[PDB]
Scaffold this active site. Structure first.
Site, mmCIF file in Angstrom:
data_model
loop_
_atom_site.group_PDB
_atom_site.id
_atom_site.type_symbol
_atom_site.label_atom_id
_atom_site.label_comp_id
_atom_site.label_asym_id
_atom_site.label_seq_id
_atom_site.Cartn_x
_atom_site.Cartn_y
_atom_site.Cartn_z
ATOM 1 C CD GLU A 110 -3.274 -0.484 1.302
ATOM 2 O OE1 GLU A 110 -3.032 -1.199 -0.276
ATOM 3 O OE2 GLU A 110 -3.989 -1.597 1.392
ATOM 4 C CG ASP A 121 -18.204 -3.601 2.472
ATOM 5 O OD1 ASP A 121 -18.497 -4.727 2.066
ATOM 6 O OD2 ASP A 121 -17.357 -2.830 2.378
ATOM 7 C CD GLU A 159 -11.038 -7.741 -2.463
ATOM 8 O OE1 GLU A 159 -12.598 -8.113 -2.647
ATOM 9 O OE2 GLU A 159 -10.539 -6.894 -2.345
ATOM 10 C CB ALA A 203 3.762 -12.825 14.206
ATOM 11 C CG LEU A 239 4.982 -16.581 11.511
ATOM 12 C CD1 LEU A 239 5.040 -17.248 12.755
ATOM 13 C CD2 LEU A 239 4.770 -14.832 10.964
ATOM 14 C CE1 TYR A 240 1.442 -14.588 7.474
ATOM 15 C CE2 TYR A 240 2.933 -14.132 5.983
ATOM 16 C CZ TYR A 240 1.966 -13.257 6.877
ATOM 17 O OH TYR A 240 1.692 -12.508 7.321
#
Lengths: 170, 170, 168, 170, 170, 168, 168, 170, 170, 170, 170, 168
Positions: K30, K49, K72, K96, K130-131
């Site tokens: 971003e 929303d 989304e 995290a 990590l993910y």
């Protein structure tokens, strides 16, 4: 042969004709003056108003015969005011009774109302008598309630209950 | 004659009103400026659809020819008073309709709206009109000095009135 | 006589549009000769109820649109207004200007009850100036380089007439 | 034979055709995609925008020939950008010069502007040459200013002043 | 063939879009639900008139027959990327228009919008389409697992991309 | 086969209006049989973008309007929706109900990816109940005096079917 | 020197209001001396983005509000504007008028790039007239019975100065 | 010592107090009921209404003394209605005359009006006498014009002209 | 120094901007009129909150003192260009911040917004500034004749530009 | 006592009204549901600010203690009638204020609004109240059967009325 | 010790601080520029929303730790994008993992989603690792997908399914 | 006794917000436990005049907020409504549930004049089910896999009570 259906935008010229007729409006204690714009704008405003139901009466030919309305529908007290008009051209044909009965049938078997009341000029005893024959009973004699044609007049308030209507022949 | 009728002003009558409203000779009787575009006319008609302080009527004969206008304005519901104003189109002036129409306006005011007092203003320079109003029951209550600027000078008008009790008593 | 002054209406806007986009005609009013019909119409809508102006169109006996007469900047306290007129090119030279100027003054002074009517006219249009003087107007100003017109700054006369003078 | 007049709503289908033509829009450095709704809505939005003047070019037959616009009109700096298009069907007929002159005449004798500038693709030297012949002079060579047909291109910025235009033959 | 053209979607093309948008077989290629009233379609068209993040095109042949649709969506102006999606109407599938139209979309994306990257999604279960995209220059960058629910089950799609430098370099 | 289910459109509202004011038909949906065209149309406008419903009309081969099918109260988390259907009086008894109920379930389960579809049917309509049972629905409730209909309170069955059952 | 001209701001409206309701002061501008604060404020809001005017307030060294200077009817094509000024009663006679008239002309001619600035002054105020003549203004009109003021119609002078003259 | 100034939002609590006082409102023939919201909302609505001028009266201490209004200002006829109120706490102090004179001075030397009129209860002869002393002359005796405190009452309409006022001592 | 930071303009910074925007000496560098009420400023700030075609920054030092402003305007997402403008408040001019801030703007433009070209305009009469821009990598591409009216006369400006490839290549 | 006063309902009195409107024992006297959020109350107050068909009053004693409420509703300006309803807060019931307050309402109705008829409804099951109304001049004109559902059952109410001529005649 | 709760208006200054931090926003691809007004106005716009859920992370002290968002959200495909940020001051504390798990728990046990995906910079292999440890699997390697800090970068798209998450220890 | 039911007010929204974002509490109402204060407040504003619901808060003697009671989907014709209740975690187990359920029925049947009140309760909450049965409710449905809650579809009981039964 006669049918009650919801009032529609295409019926407004017919209603306009009745709302400006002094003889006819005197039965509803209303002022006989209403431009088409006032009529249509009020119709638009009340489209979604659940406190009223306005019906038009048609015959097999789809000729516009009259008007029937249930107004001030209250859903805690379960009451409403009934009023009716038969166009000049169709009066004295015996239709009134059938229509009063249709309106009570709608009120009591569809809307599930407890009480239906009306107002009738004391000086219109033949209308009073018809309503009595259709089961309504006088619960009030309102003194000088409405100014009509130059003076104050009295009106009867008459009513009928759901239980009496649903069960009368039982 | 008695085949003249008063009815509510409608949008389809606006071309007729526009024609009177842009006529210097006709508008002088109402102390009004004779200039009004059709759009001003119509937008003001739209604005006042629901204004309960006035009643605007058009006058027709049996053949639906538009004869003139009758207005009850500044209707006040505490004081029970209103101002009456009338216009007879050029082609129909002098035929004897004026008294009938004044009487219809009074009838409306006193037997339907239940007003107490109707007043009007009329040019001192039109004494025949002052006279006609007197014969119709109106009485002078004021002689307003240089009240209106009309055709190049300040003019005086009579203010005249009639009460409900006087009208309904005969 | 058979020339008539009446309120400007929506159906007359094509005729106004044609004059408003004519360079030769708008030069007499010191105005840019460009106006889409949408701008014209939208401004007309905006001013329907504006009491500070009166716009009239001029018609003959056959309902032919002759020109335009306007009373603008009508002031409520000072009782003054600016007058302006246009005669369509095909109808000029027929001597209608004098009759129309007089109708405008009659309206201003016998109907609106105004005290003063003034106008602006190009110094380089001495026939118009002479014509206004004949109708009772008098010069009260010579405005220096007031408007940019066809490539240069030009002078205009301001002229006026009072109600007391006209009503006598 | 040719005339400049203000753009009107009835001219928008013609403009739409030009605004979606890739060859034509490349001269204005614009993307050749614009629905009629986007076009019309932007037209409506700018009706009263005094920072632009959009003209349509017609011949004696009222055929739509092209477009001329003065945009970014600044009233302190007294400058504007000029741009022009001649429909494909009417190019190479010699009309460009007459129209450039009409636009300068409008800018300098009507709007009272001080400076008019434009942009032209360096790769369009015949357009550059025409503008020079009409009195414009290069004041910039903008490097890779616009992405056009797959690559960045340079454009000339060219201008003319009111004093030079008004007085050139004096 | 090369007489196919891409142009901006217009309101007059909406009945054609509505017909594709309510076709289960056509909408499965875009992973979209095949239900859209004309009013939803049109109101969404109205809402996005000025949305710069998309470009919607209709494809026509020389006779003005509507052939299909091409859309560039999620246009991002920092990252210079967009998603490409295409539909060829049923009656025109298999005629050899697909490659031409893909090429036109790429041309638009890379020579006009100046984008850096175009990507698409295509069903793994349509390997002939995956193959065609590869021959048109696209390369798989993702195999998205159970990404979309389509006709009763979760399906996988390939994500494929092509870059501006690759497209313009030959 | 040649019966088709498609999104409700504005041009179909006269047909809906006729059903909505028919007492016999609205009795099957427990609804008051009174609705002006303006109320119908204005509600339709209001719900154009409402994702919680899908209204379909049923057409035959000749484009004749056959009936109406609706999926309402579509829930985003629980993946459930209520199903309701009406077949115009002239088209009943032709055996279309079964085909249409099946189309609705196909839409719900193969397109919207719902988990559960339920419906309400009058206990006093055992043929409809039997028909829903044949299409895979099962009773999960007998609601006591749930609706006031033609003068008295009546009972209705709530019936349901799951995606796992239908997709096998 | 230490007198400064700056854009009118919302916080200065109480000071403007006080001048706008002062009969003696508004007499110099031919304006009715009645304006509620709500009318003043609402008009100010209305004209925030109006490019046809520039309103300034005058302040001294201690931020005391001295008066008001305005350029109105700014015209885009003709490059003209009307100038008007008021000096608060307590600050008059201190010789500030000349400095301020000059600041206004500097703004008009060196910043807005205008061609002509004009003003109106009562004929019955010959000291103001003399003061404008000293600052370079010249009479171009004597407007007859232009404004109704304190009970009678009065004459005013229209005076102007051009950019070419001022910039030399 | 006394001053007339335009009515301001900070004066509305004072006005509210007067508009709900039955004794005070009877002098204006107005109903003595008005919530602060109705008052304030009507004030907001008329901010830009040029047909009226509403003044508040203050003394040297800035105490609120009374109200003076010019209403129904007509700019063709050049007339307006004048009305005044002095708070109960400040009556009988002799202020009325000074204020009537200030209002005439405003009307005739500032607004350039031709005629100012007023209404006064026939049953309030001391107010009638004061107005006469201030130059007003009776032009009407309106019969049963207003319902006040239980019955219909008559009122005088009185006026004064600009020429008489401006020149009386000349 | 390098403890200077660029951040988005916020509402709390508007008094600082108002002070620069009403300074004749500061606004001459941007060829803008030095008059802007706080309400115009703020309402324009409100209007452009979501305008993607500009980025407005304020510059602060380590102590949060406001140093000046940096703006990237007319951001075009096809052509990848924008105009850069900068103001260093009076009290901070000449301290050596200009080059750092120009570099930060370029960094933002080229490493974040991914633009291709940044241009600016600078007075020919300020050759020291022209020089500084040249040393920062900018190159003259135009000498615009009598482009802006500033302090009594028409002045010329240089248009200067730098490309992304040049900036990122070292 | 006579130091009780009636005045227009104001926004500052709404907490007092909210407290009565949410009291089951108090609202049963008006045949109304005892549930109203402050927001419903207030938004309905806002909606009816300019509604001429009602007049809502609060009752205070000399110390400004809020005593109760008095409302005149369904004011009809042709028929000259309205419904009167009253509430005396719990802490003040039985002190002898009721008759005074009824008299003040009648005074307002008949000496100010100039109405012809005032009516009310009162529970048949509260005969002491029926009695008090009779002594205050009211007379029964109706006995409405099962008119309202209150505390678990349908109840009857008397409708009672008094006319202007009777009230003012002594 | 850590909790996820819905984002609230009182958390916006914290979010504003993160949205303007270049290091932090680079993880979400971003642009690090956002005025408080843009932030707050977009927050207001998305209140209802349903396609997103935004959470704030707090510890026992109610200190703002980070952000977690599901965006989304598609209710036919049952998928959403997950993204997370831990404020600079709280990174490297081991939080995290706990937060990724909370987000999956919300997505899979509350929202009933089928698939959660994310994007991570290929150049951030420790985040990728990590993910992976938290159960995500690479399904794409998007080539030059985002322009970040001066060049185009590749990102991994990684996902996890509801069935795998709900059942892994079974 | 000293527990009181009263209309939900704006000042009670922080308390509602706290319950609406509590997973354990919203699980009893089958609702997602996420609601910003802005969403809550905006919906509250939207429904101020919605006659189809009544929301009450429960307070003790010290004005402490105890819980929440709501009557929703109130139907005008069928005279039915759904009932739901929450008791704040700190106030549970004090035996308040029974008193409150009874207040809700009293309101429904002695004030709103309804015919039927129904509710939904998780099959996996047999103590709540037992408690509703003691207060006069009876099961009329066992809804299969009706709601997705904490990772799986769950069954709920629908239970009802009629006005005639309660008023005796």
């Amino acid at each position: 042969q006669l049918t009650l259906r919801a009032l529609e935008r295409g019926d407004l010229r017919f209603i306009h004709n009745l709302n400006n007729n002094r003889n006819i409006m005197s039965y509803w204690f209303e002022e006989p003056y209403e431009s088409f714009d006032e009529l249509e704008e009020l119709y638009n405003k009340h489209i979604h108003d659940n406190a009223e139901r306005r019906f038009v009466v048609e015959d097999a030919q789809k000729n516009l015969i009259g008007l029937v309305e249930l107004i001030e529908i209250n859903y805690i007290h379960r009451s409403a005011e009934f009023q009716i008009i038969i166009a000049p051209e169709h009066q004295g044909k015996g239709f009134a009774r059938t229509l009063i009965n249709r309106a009570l049938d709608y009120s009591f078997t569809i809307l599930n109302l407890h009480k239906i009341y009306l107002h009738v000029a004391v000086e219109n005893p033949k209308a009073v008598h018809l309503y009595e024959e259709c089961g309504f009973v006088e619960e009030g004699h309102l003194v000088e309630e409405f100014f009509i044609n130059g003076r104050y007049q009295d009106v009867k308030r008459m009513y009928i209950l759901q239980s009496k209507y649903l069960n009368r022949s039982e």
